[PDB]
């Protein structure tokens, strides 16, 4: 029973301890629904944390660290019970144990604690976890241990309020440089996900990622054989291209766009959608970035998905089209018109997502304002496909911005 285990664990004799703590560990590691609450409510936690101090019995340290790892794998309440027992400084001690299993288990437990949230992340950081954690990365490290290390690194990079300290990012990025040249799939996936959490942290974090030189190593993973690596890399570079034009251009300079035909035609709708999201952040850029998308032969594929993709992909393709009109030249917009953008663009005017309707109206407005002489041609194209009637109907839409813009488009371009 738990009473028995607690009584045996609190002895001053390390053999009785070891016996009881192994029993608790077994309770916590034998299935996927462990009795965490019952072991917390038994009072065992400060006992396990004390066991962590016993450098004379490494087996005891290991069993207690495993038990605490699994307790800290549960909810925030359970992780926090572990944190409030003072486990963190002792786990950081055990990062220097001569015993490999104790060391790895300590890394694991700290992973769960850091994962609970940004203030736990920053407490563990402030006590100096990063330098000893990165000191494990070596040619000789066992691969399972290295995978746990890079998972912990994912957790050090994630959470955003606040994002990790600048100094920590500076310390982690060289480790990510090393690890992104790895061939193990889980290491790559976790490395790229850590980078993607960093590039979502702010434009200054993006700049740090860029300044590390790692982007040219990240872009070619969009064609990795493993779809998990592909999608992680798409997230990482996509977050970069949410930044400034210069930051986006760093990515474009690596020939990113050549990897997208295979993503726009991927069987998985979610990958089509994510790829179009990326490209819509490209076409929101300057004239040269719009031209890069054109030159890469991606516009017909975008328009095809605007017409025949799942609705999620279609929404993203609408953004791609409309964003192109922010800074795109008259000739670039004309190329869109030649590629038959108008009918599938207009088909979206009737959906219940008011955001998409606004996006498409904004795009049609910019297109008409841009096509000085051709505005009559384009207007007739809009009329042909039924778009004009849909604008007329949107004059009755609930949303002021939408029906305002519909009135204005009709008055400015369909009232001659």
């Amino acid at each position: 029973s738990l009473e028995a285990i607690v009584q045996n664990a609190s002895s001053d004799n390390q053999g009785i301890q070891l016996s009881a703590v192994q029993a608790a560990r077994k309770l916590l590691s034998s299935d996927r629904n462990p009795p965490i609450d019952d072991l917390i409510k038994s009072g065992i936690l400060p006992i396990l944390v004390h066991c962590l101090e016993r450098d004379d019995n490494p087996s005891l340290q290991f069993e207690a660290a495993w038990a605490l790892t699994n307790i800290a794998s549960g909810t925030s309440e359970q992780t926090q019970a572990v944190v409030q027992s003072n486990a963190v400084p002792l786990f950081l001690r055990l990062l220097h144990s001569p015993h490999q299993n104790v060391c790895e288990q300590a890394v694991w437990a700290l992973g769960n604690i850091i994962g609970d949230g940004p203030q736990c992340r920053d407490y563990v950081i402030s006590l100096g976890v990063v330098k000893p954690l990165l000191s494990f990365i070596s040619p000789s490290i066992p691969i399972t241990f290295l995978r746990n290390v890079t998972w912990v690194m994912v957790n050090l990079c994630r959470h955003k309020d606040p994002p990790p300290p600048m100094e920590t990012i500076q310390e982690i990025l060289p480790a990510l440089c090393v690890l992104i040249h790895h061939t193990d799939v889980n290491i790559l996936v976790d490395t790229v996900w850590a980078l993607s959490y960093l590039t979502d942290a702010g434009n200054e974090q993006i700049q740090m990622v860029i300044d590390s030189g790692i982007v040219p190593h990240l872009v070619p993973l969009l064609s990795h054989q493993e779809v998990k690596v592909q999608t992680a890399a798409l997230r990482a570079v996509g977050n970069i291209v949410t930044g400034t034009d210069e930051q986006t251009q760093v990515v474009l300079n690596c020939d990113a766009l050549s990897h997208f035909p295979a993503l726009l035609t991927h069987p998985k709708e979610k990958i089509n959608k994510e790829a179009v999201w990326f490209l819509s952040n490209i076409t929101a850029g300057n004239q040269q970035q719009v031209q890069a998308v054109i030159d890469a032969n991606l516009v017909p594929m975008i328009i095809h998905l605007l017409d025949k993709g799942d609705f999620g992909t279609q929404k993203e393709a609408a953004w791609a089209i409309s964003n192109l009109t922010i800074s795109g030249r008259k000739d670039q917009v004309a190329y869109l018109i030649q590629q038959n953008v108008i009918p599938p663009f207009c088909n979206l005017l009737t959906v219940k997502d008011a955001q998409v309707v606004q996006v498409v109206l904004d795009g049609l407005s910019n297109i008409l304002k841009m096509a000085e002489d051709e505005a009559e041609t384009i207007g007739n194209l809009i009329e042909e496909c039924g778009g004009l009637e849909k604008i007329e109907q949107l004059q009755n839409h609930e949303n002021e911005d939408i029906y305002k813009l519909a009135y204005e488009i009709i008055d400015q371009f369909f009232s001659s």
Binding site: T69, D116, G243
Partner: peptide, 24 residues
């Protein structure tokens, strides 16, 4: 408003876990 957009809900949902138990 037109322009760049952050990663959208429903994207990249196969993320690494924040926590793992060690099961035998």
């Amino acid at each position: 408003c037109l322009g760049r957009r952050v990663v959208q809900p429903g994207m990249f949902e196969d993320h690494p876990p924040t926590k793992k138990a060690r099961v035998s």
